[PDB]
Amino acid sequence: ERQKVCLDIIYKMMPKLKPVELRELLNPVVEFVSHPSTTCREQMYNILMWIHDNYRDPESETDNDSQEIFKLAKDVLIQGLIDENPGLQLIIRNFWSHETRLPSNTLDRLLALNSLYSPKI
């Protein structure tokens, strides 16, 4: 419960931090991939979808953190397709399979599935 409320106070305060702070916060939240208590893990993934969608940086490259944390977020959000809980794994599957995160020509989707290799899976 402490960790779930912590992840809540870090989800609500998150669209105010600057990448310098979000970087130092992103370590012990992505440390939640090996967690029991699927609710805290769903909060982790649920802040990481935000961190992913609002940090894609569509060809800006202005900040090292604003692409390093996107690297780490991508790493842990593709590390969730193998989640040992249906539904939650289904949520991550739907997150990835929606338009504009994996394409749908089945050619560029094929070339894009390589981008989510991430050895860990």
Distance of CA 9 to the CA centre of its chain: 17
Which residue, chain included where needed, has tokens 């960790």?
3
DSSP 117: -
Scanning the structure block, which residue is given the tokens 């769903």?
A: 42
Give the separation between CA 62 and CA 56, rounded to whole angstroms.
12
Give the C-alpha distances (Å, rounded to integers) separating 118 from 59, 76, 121.
Answer: 22, 9, 6
* Distance in angstroms (rounded) separating the CA atoms of residues 42 and 76: 12
Tokens 């931090």: give the residue: 17
Owner of token pair 């749908």 = 104
Cβ pair 33, 44 in contact under 8 A = yes
Over 41-85, what HEC string results?
Answer: HHHHHHHHHHHHHCCCCCCCCCCCHHHHHHHHHHHHHHCCCCCCC
Nearest alpha carbon to residue 10 among 40, 54, 33, 55: 40
Contacts for 116 with CB less than 8 Å, ≥ 6 apart: 74, 78, 81, 96, 102
How far is residue 29's CA from residue 16's CA, in Å, rounded to a whole number?
A: 17
CA-to-CA separations, 45 to 3, 64, 93, 105, 114, in angstroms, rounded:
14, 22, 12, 27, 21
Q: Both tokens of residue 85? A: 């809980």
Name residue, tokens 């991939």. Answer: 33
Inter-axis angle of helices 38-53 and 2-12, to 10 degrees?
20
Whether the Cβ atoms of residue 83 and residue 40 lie closer than 8 Å to each other: no
Report resolution (Å) to 1 decimal: 3.3
**Which pairs count as long-range contacts for 94-102, CB under 8 Å and 24+ apart, including other chains?**
95/45, 95/49
